[model samples]
Target: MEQKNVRNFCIIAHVDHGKSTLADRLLEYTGAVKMQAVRMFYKAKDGNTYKLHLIDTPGHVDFSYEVSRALAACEGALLLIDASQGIEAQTVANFWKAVEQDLVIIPVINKIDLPSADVDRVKKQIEEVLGLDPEEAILASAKEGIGIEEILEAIVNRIPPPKGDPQKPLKALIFDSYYDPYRGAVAFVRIFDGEVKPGDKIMLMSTGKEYEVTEVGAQTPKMTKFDKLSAGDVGYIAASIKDVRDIRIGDTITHAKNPTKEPVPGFQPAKPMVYAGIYPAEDTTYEELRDALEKYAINDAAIVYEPESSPALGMGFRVGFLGLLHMEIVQERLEREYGVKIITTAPNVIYRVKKKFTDEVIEVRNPMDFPDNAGLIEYVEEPFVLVTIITPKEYVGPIIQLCQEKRGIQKNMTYLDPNTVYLEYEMPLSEIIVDFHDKIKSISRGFASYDYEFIGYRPSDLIKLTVLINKKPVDALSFIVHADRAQKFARRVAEKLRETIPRQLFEVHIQVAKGGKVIASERIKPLR
Candidate 1:
């Protein structure tokens, strides 16, 4: 059967902004799944577990590559907005990606049942921000199943019908895949054109590879099968492929008769944005850590590692991650999944260093691995972020003041509704990773929502504020900072770390340094 009539759309919104819940409702209302079949008692894993095989992607900027992959697989998208929060930074980032594809969008304002939610405000904001006055507005309360059908109808109507040549050679986008212990590697693919069927010979255009499809499975209420899948539908097909390494995301599937005219474009490996050296808390956990990381690497291909010998903690690996959260998550998963105890060094962003005379480029991650003489130190590593803050009229001044204090430059500001103002700013990545989330929460009384993207690298006047215990550099107590903010930041971070971090057997000193000269120093005793 041809893959037409399938509406391939992604659901993107801020974290905890009802993207998943809305997906659950969409699935149930469209008869994509029976309402009684879904287990509402627990958290839903993916779109399929509740019906509707919508591609799920993390909203964090660190997973920008994953989001990009999802965008490539879909021709339409559902831009979810929380009526109470209005537009956030992640919303803007996701919206930007959708607009780039010019994909048909069905903007939905979710959480209409919340007492604080202002649906009209969010609708106007979506129209203004996305420049889309969508004919359909889904006022949904996923918890109560309100306005669920409206969203489904809007999806079928607003999203474009599949269009492509089914008679031509096969072309499918391998958006994602998973390892099933019972069935081997299950590749979740979207058929862009041509036909795919069980027992048919297929090849990956990107890798110049071939596989035999053991089963062709699609999504509705449950798995459905067809002899051939043509243009537009999304489905999962099994190939009995053992090695997880063989299947690559973004690979294109094509018929064996006529291989792809061109290899799939934009298929590049993910590069981690953050780095940390991991060591075992106990020597026994070393192997456990390695095994845990091995599993993690399977799920997140961006996680990279290299073996290293540490004087303090023996053998370890220098691990790389997409960003700070990515690093933290990997570490957390290793402990939870494999039950491994590990000691990790401070997470650091890669810095670019240029040699004074030769103009050579070097990327530095570990703080202790700063290059010798490091030539002209140029600028420390920093990522730019596009941040959005929505606050009541009274708090705008304080919010902007705080953002400006943290090296944020206002990009734009607009009033979506009466009291709600949307403020946009471009801020330094360093400011964000270093407790920016908590800082915003504190200042905004937990009402401010921040969304960010890794815009690009920027030159920063960064200083390594090293917290010293007994005059030695305390690896766990240092942070990168702008020169001007060093003094206050030094005091705050040093105090916080000193209180939070376990005390050493001996006294410790905290210091801020540039070129080995201590600019500021603080001392801590072994006992509280």
Candidate 2:
């Protein structure tokens, strides 16, 4: 099969914006599969069987790295937008990724059957904001299966097929992999150069681990065995490797005998942005939690963890994640998928701290480790983001005021149309991670959408806000916040502690302070 006949693309959109549904319709219309899931293969009208691989990705911000990996495996992307909702946060976020990957983007407006759907309005936004021609956008309703044929046609006509050399040394990108009880570790790969077949000796470029390929197959939405996978093809390979840790996403696989001089571009390990203490709710389940986390980490490399013991919470793992949603998803998966009930502390963002005299730099994942004000701290830096919000023009005033209240600096604003506006800001990532999204929705009456990207770190007047109970510090309750808002935030924390902590025989004192000076205090009266 030639590379020009293959179309590798994925659907990228916001949550509940019909990405999965649109993918299902595409698979169905192309006779690829009859189900809903990730990655599919289809044939086109060129009288040759065309391989269409659709990478299904999670829409949450925490999984942005996953989205990037998916994009790296394809040559094109379908930018799905909700006709009734216009543009959204993840829509803008994922669009930039596609643009960065240099994928041919197909602007698709979905859910056209909705009564309130304004196709023209969304088309204009795609043109003005996304810099795509409104006339080139494809409008369809996934539920009714309308415009699916047109979408398929557009995919074949507009989106260029993947270009790679079948004659080059084997280079396959492992986009995803998982553990199978019977087959061991199976890797889903996108072959960029050369070919691979059964009995071929392969080396995982990242780990330098070699294996003998026992099986090669394509997903007919289900695994269908094949003789070999050529360049520009998406498929899987089973090597009888038992350990899942041996296979990694974004790693390159090449022929052991004839390997490429350099691996394919854009290969970097996933780095965690948020950290939390995860302990089992039941003390007896401590080992179970540890094993579950270990097993889960084998597949999810984004989660990084290490053993730690807490005086109050017993033994637990200090886990790290890409974002809050990633932390939540891992917690939910631990409970539901692995049946491990766990309690997690409040999430903490990573901080960079430098010593004044020694010039030693340290990365702080836990606030309890933050140096005291009397220490040799030279300066502290915190992560910040470039945030974009799309909302109705009427809510612009309130939205801007809310951003200012959250210590946000407005960058710019543009009107997409007479009634809609797009606003940009440079805001502290900490402020946005906490409750900025919810506040924006509340203030805008659910008419606003926001997206943000980490724009490096900025120095700030930061201090450790510690909560004290009976004059003892609680490590889990400690966090770093800006000095200006410490008092205002401390008062609320003190009041909340008083309400939540039950009265005891001894008079319990709840205090919120910045280092030694108590900024707010509340007393939980003893039992009468």
Candidate 3:
């Protein structure tokens, strides 16, 4: 097939904007391409068959890194917006990502089958908020298979053919990869230049490691064996490579003997925003948890961890994730996929701490590592994010009140329309990751949607709240929080401990303190 007949693209959506459903329906109409990804041959009225490669991205802000990597492999994107809900914060955020990369974006209004569908209003919002042509926007309902054909035609006609010389040295981007126990490490790649085939020796530019390509093919929805993957092709290559870490996402792969002179640019690693302690269940061993994590994280390059131990929780790894949702995903994957029962402690964001009278600054991930002496701390800075919310105008007051309760600093507000409101608030990541989405949904009756991007660290009045059992401080129960809520949080934790702890022969003391000064306490009565 000619490169001119190829179209590479992905779908970007806010949470539950029908990215996956659209993919399934598109596949239902056209056939084959499940990876929420793409590989289909479409025959247009022009009598030409086009190979459309679609990459489906995760919609949550935590998986923004994943979205960027997917976008890197495409020449175009479908910005999926719910017609009933109109434009959302994440849809706007991801649109900016595609714009920065200079990819062609096709505005799509989805869920047109719903009674609440406002095609005209959504089109207007697309024009005002997204600055896209209203007439070009495709009104789609994946459930009913409406406008699927238009989307496919737009993908082929609007998305420009990939630019690269097939005669040039092999240069492929490893946008995604997974650990295949049978085949070792398998990498999903977008070939920008030259070609790759079985029996070819490949070099990973990042690690400068070489491996023989034992298999190379396209995932025509499924892994279909191919003799060669040339320029402008989206496919997978298996090199029988051992160790998942060797093949990294955003890495450039080239021929070992005839390598490309320059590595692919715009390669940025995932920046994990939250850290949590993951320990094995009562019946699971430490090494089992380690192995499960190792296998589970092969598919998620963003999941980072280091061996750590807590006196209360025993041996565990302090794993860093993109966000709270991402942390939960990994925990669930480990337990369900690997059958390794795990325990997850409180999730935390990083803090920059400066020691008193010392030039040394440390990045704190665990509360146990926090300076016991608050007086010795010069300043503690917590990460803040710029959170954008798209909600109904009526819920603006409630949403503002919610942000104020979370210690948010207002940035700006906009009226996208007479009925819709746009809000910006600079808030601590710690506050947003904990029930902020749920709270916003409840307050707004499930109409509000939010997306956040980490800005930088701001100096804050933060203190470590420690929980002690029988006068012994439990490492896992310690956390860093704003001083304003320290007593409130302490009281809740202490009361919860009193209810959960079993009574012994003697009374057991449960205490919550700030800097060793008890702020809240509870006692579990003896059996008598």
Candidate 4:
């Protein structure tokens, strides 16, 4: 039997495929919000405000960890597909998580007003991918509010009701959280069991911090008094907490009464996969970047960081991220929100650790930063990700061929729908350390989506490429790559890096080498 009444679900989709827009409409249709309130809720959600405890996740590939968190928190999910764009390569990944959660899913074909809206095709795709018929395929223009009420009704029908133990100790899994100047850090969590109320003593499982619940309420952006939160309801708890470092996303909140012995599962935070150095284009933005990043870090707790500098560039940051798009988003937000002009170094993965003498473990980030003289060495580099792609049958062969050429191991292939195919591949972090998303878009004619996670490391033959002008190493030209793709990779890297690099006073040499062997070399004249 279900334990809670108010519905809790998340919208899932590929980047820019309309998850947020659909979520906005879903709120409107349910009377949880109004038309004018749609964008406000989106901003509120983004701003870490309160409004029905809705979870707004970015559809971008770089934020997979965010999707993972959303999946762990909600009992049901709404799958939004772009009617005109059809099924993307990421649809399978999104659908798989919902299925894994055993969610009651409502397949939605968004943008029904578009001429290319193919409801039938997308419905077939959903069934073929999800292995079940959606309770209903709702055709809606979230922007126009068409069929939105029906979509919510479908959610009401298909999504399972939340079930938990009210008699048990109170436990809440934090999916989204924020900080306010007055109340400190405000946490948003979905209650799993027992009851929560104002004045209750609470403990955060992750930080081990105990606090008196100063306020309990529904937060749209600001905290208000919530009378009580029970099993299955999403609500906010203000614990008079001051620092965001203390109240983390993916942590758990439990009542002091009959407190939980162990924290909720899936509370361990995900770490960033890629690292880069950031510098100011305008020196004045340094303090602004510093303060802005500090505030932003509270929201994007997944990011990791350090401080470092180059001779050419003075003070800056060595920031880390989930992937390329994440790095882009951070940079964009810095420039747009913080009004900072900044430049960044290329992103690199943190390396594997192995002992020098007794086979102990050590972690390294920079390739050049590693000591080469360690005679006792086990091959190590950054972890790889298993990338799965779904494409039209006509393009599957080419996609497979390209992935294979990139040292990807072909795993499995399935026909997900009438005309679509799913292709799985294991790709090293090296393959996508460059402009991976853009490259995939070009190869797939912007029809592909890529999903990947850090699988453990394997033995790899890697090489370091160094570009030099007048026989001196140009720090900006250094990159790590697999040996086999040296020539082609060197050419690609040379072309790409050259587009951004300033022309030197002398001819530049781009050299690709594995150990002592130089596999490829290219030269370009200095600017006249």
Candidate 5:
């Protein structure tokens, strides 16, 4: 197909807001699948029979980077919002992300069949918060297949087709890849320019590794072999790559004979923001866990892990993640998919540490590795983020107070309308990574939405809060906390340990401290 006849777009929304369902409806309407297929590429009508490439992206905050990758592979996105729930934190976040990519963001309101559906309120949110015209918002219920035809028509007519040169050297962007035992590794790519076919010599621009393209195919809801994948196409290419590590996501694919002068822009490797120690529940499975993680890491480039030994948790790997949910998802996949039962310590953010009297700067992931307090540290810095919250006007007070408790400074506030408010704040990322979202929902009766992004690091009055069990420090339970809030946090950890620890013949000492000073102490009495 010609570049002008190819429409590449993606669907993005908050979790449980009908992203996957919308994707399925599109597939069904196009006759690509029967409501049970994984992915699709098919033709639909507008002014021409356009070949649509639809990418269904995850809605969780952790996968925001993944969503970005998907957005880069397309020219437009269907921004779906639930009518009953109105606008959400991620809805606003993703809208900005799509805008940043310069994508044609089509506003959509889904689940209009529900009793609590308030299309008018949602339309206002789409207009006021997202800055989209309410008149352009499409209403649909994916379950009932309502307005599917309109969505298809809008996608074909509004979303621009891919723009690339078929005569140029092959330069495809590997948006996603996965390991296959039989086929080695397969890459999902969006060809930016040029063409590739069977027997062509290829190279991964990022790693400089070479491979021979043995097979190529397009997924019409299933893998269908093809002779060639030309420019402006979304399809998979198999290069007989035995190692999954060789096929890195976001890497550029180019012809070995005639490579592009430079790889695609914005090709930064995914860096993990959160770190945790993951240990096998049983010591015997240490090596097994390592092997499993290695294989799993082949498919997921965002995950970074290395071997580390914990006295309490035994042999394990200290793993890095993009966010809290990313950590959870990896853990769940490990246990369920790989059959490796693991235990994870509390998640912590990467802290930037600068040394005193020296130009040495380091990243601190483990609290145990923090520099000594004997004037060895010039200043401790922590990551900060710009947070945006959309909520009802009535709940602004509690939400503001919640932000204040988390050491947040209000940047600005805008009334989206008489009933809705948009608030912005600058706060520590550590505060938001904890129970901040849950607390916000609680205080606002689940009426508020939130989103945040990194805003560099700032100097903080930080202290390492240590927990002592039976007078011995538990390194696994130690965390970096704000000095002003250390005592309150210490008391809570101490009390929890007191309740969980079994009573012994002798009383057990449970203490929380800042360095050598005991901030909070609790004792577990002996059982008579």
Candidate 6:
């Protein structure tokens, strides 16, 4: 299809908002819903056939980088808002994200069939939060297939057609990397300036690697193979990309022989925010564990790793993830898909350290990498994030107290309505990784929704704490914490060790030491 006849777009909303889930029978409820299918040939009342690419992207904050890549492939988006939930955290942020990309967002107030669906409040939120005209929104129930034609008409009319020149040299944006046995690894791309076919040699501008195109097609539920993929079309391109690292998401794919003058601008690779150590489970073989990781790692560029060892955990890999959820999910994938179980250490965000006398600063992905000489440390900086929370009004006091305990600084607070409140906070990323999400969810009775973005690092009085059993340092139990709560943290750890360790024959000393001083210590009585 030509540029004028193609429409590349996606949907944005909160995770599990019914509209974004597969359980909703999204496509059966309404053919316009994403996730079930992407790319379609729709015939309109105007008697013209238009090719629509409904890019199915996850709505969770952890997969936000993927969402951004998916957004980069499109020219417009459908802002799906749940009628009962009004404007939740991800819904608001993803909407703003689409606006930042300068994409045309058409709001769709979904799930009007339910008795709890309040279309008016959702429309009000559309105007207030997204700043889009609520009157322009299409009220529909995807479950009932209502207002389906209006959606198609609005998409064909309101969303502008992509602008590109097929005559130009091939320059397509690779938005996703999928690994399948048949394709090895396929590059999901959006053609911007030219075309590609089964025989052309393609070059990845970022990696400078070249591969001969083996296949090309649109992802029309199935891999619909075609002769050529032209400008403004969304589809997949295969070139024997065996490893996910071989082809980076956001890379520009151009003809090696007839390269474009420049690569696609504004495309970006994901930066990991959380780091953890993954060791093989007790009965796991070293080769099986390592092999499992390598095989699985071939699929996601976001999950990065490097081999490292811990005295307590045996051989392991220091893994980097976008967030805690990504960490849990990849672990499960390895066990569930690869039959290799792994144990994970507590995850932490990267911190910055400034040398005492020099202008040098280092990023500490692992706390054990802290400067060996504590005297030479000038200051430590912890990563901070801008977090937004939406909940019912009654939960404000408890949530605010919890935020204060986490050392959060209030950025803003406002009422969405008499019953709903929206809160914003600037908090250290370290405070959130452990149990912040669970606490907020519990306090709000599962009514609150949360999302965060890393802003930058801020200096704090952070000190490293190490645990010693019988005077031997354990690398796995060590961590860096703020000086204000250093003693309490040490006390808490020492008490836990006391509880977990059974009484021994000889005197066993459990201690948490900071520098050369033991801040907290406990002694177990010898079993009589």
lDDT winner among the candidates?
A: 3
Q: What's each prediction's TM-score? A: 0.85, 0.93, 0.94, 0.86, 0.93, 0.92
Residue 178 in candidate 5, Cα distance off native in Å: 1.5
lDDT of 6 by residue, 293-316 (tens): 888776777888888887876788
Give the Cα-based TM-score of candidate 5 against the true structure: 0.93
Backbone Cα, N, C clashes tallied per candidate: 8, 0, 0, 9, 0, 0
Mind giving the per-residue lDDT tens digits that candidate 3 earns over 1-528?
589999999988877878888887777778732373357888887789888887767767787766777888899999999988888888889999999888999999999999988989988888898899998899888988889998988988889989999899999987777777777788888999999999999999987899999888876777787898999998888898885567777789999999998987767667788998988886999999999887777676677899888787799998898887788788777888899998788789999999988787999988789998998999999999999999999999999999998999899999888999999999999998777889999999998888888899999999999899989988888999899978887987788789877677888999999886899999988887
Taken over the whole model, the C-alpha lDDT of each candidate is: 0.69, 0.82, 0.86, 0.68, 0.82, 0.82
Decide which is better by TM-score, 2 or 4.
Answer: 2
Tell me the TM-score of model 2: 0.93
Cα lDDT of model 2 by residue, 370-412, tens digit: 8866367788899998989888999999999999988999999
After superposing candidate 4 on the true structure, give the runs of residues whose Cα lies further than 4 Å from its correct spot.
1-4, 30-53, 220-223, 282-292, 312-314, 353-358, 372-377, 474-477, 497-499, 503-527
Question: In angstroms, how far off is 7's CA in candidate 5?
Answer: 0.9
lDDT of 1 at 87: 76
Clashing pairs in 6: none
**What would the per-residue lDDT of candidate 1 be over residues 1-528, giving only the tens digit for each residue?**
223345567888877789777766665654531111111111122232212246666678777766777777777788888877877767777888777767777787878889999877777776766677744667778778887666655655567656767777788877677676665676777766787888888887766677898887665436555575666666777777764456677778887778658654677667777777888875547777777878777666567798865543477888888877787788788878788888876666776655456466667666555543434565455678778776677778888988999989999997756776788899876676667778777877877776666679887766666655556665544556677897787667667656755677767666655547667666667665
- Per-residue lDDT for 1-528 in model 4, tens only? 234334577777766767767765655554451111011122221233222335555566676655666677777777778887777766667777667766766677888788878778777776767665744677788879887667655555556657877778988887666666777777777788887888889988877778998877664433446688778777677888876657777788887656887787766666777878787785656677677788778656667766666555666777888788888888888888777788887778777645466466666554445444334555556577888886777777767777877778988888767677777789888677776667677777877666776788776665566554344554444666665777787677666655655777776665554444555566777768
Among all windows of ten consecutive residues in candidate 2, which has the lowest summed lDDT?
32-41
Tell me model 2's lDDT, rounded to 2 decimals. Answer: 0.82
Every candidate's CA RMSD: 5.2, 2.5, 2.2, 5.1, 2.6, 2.9
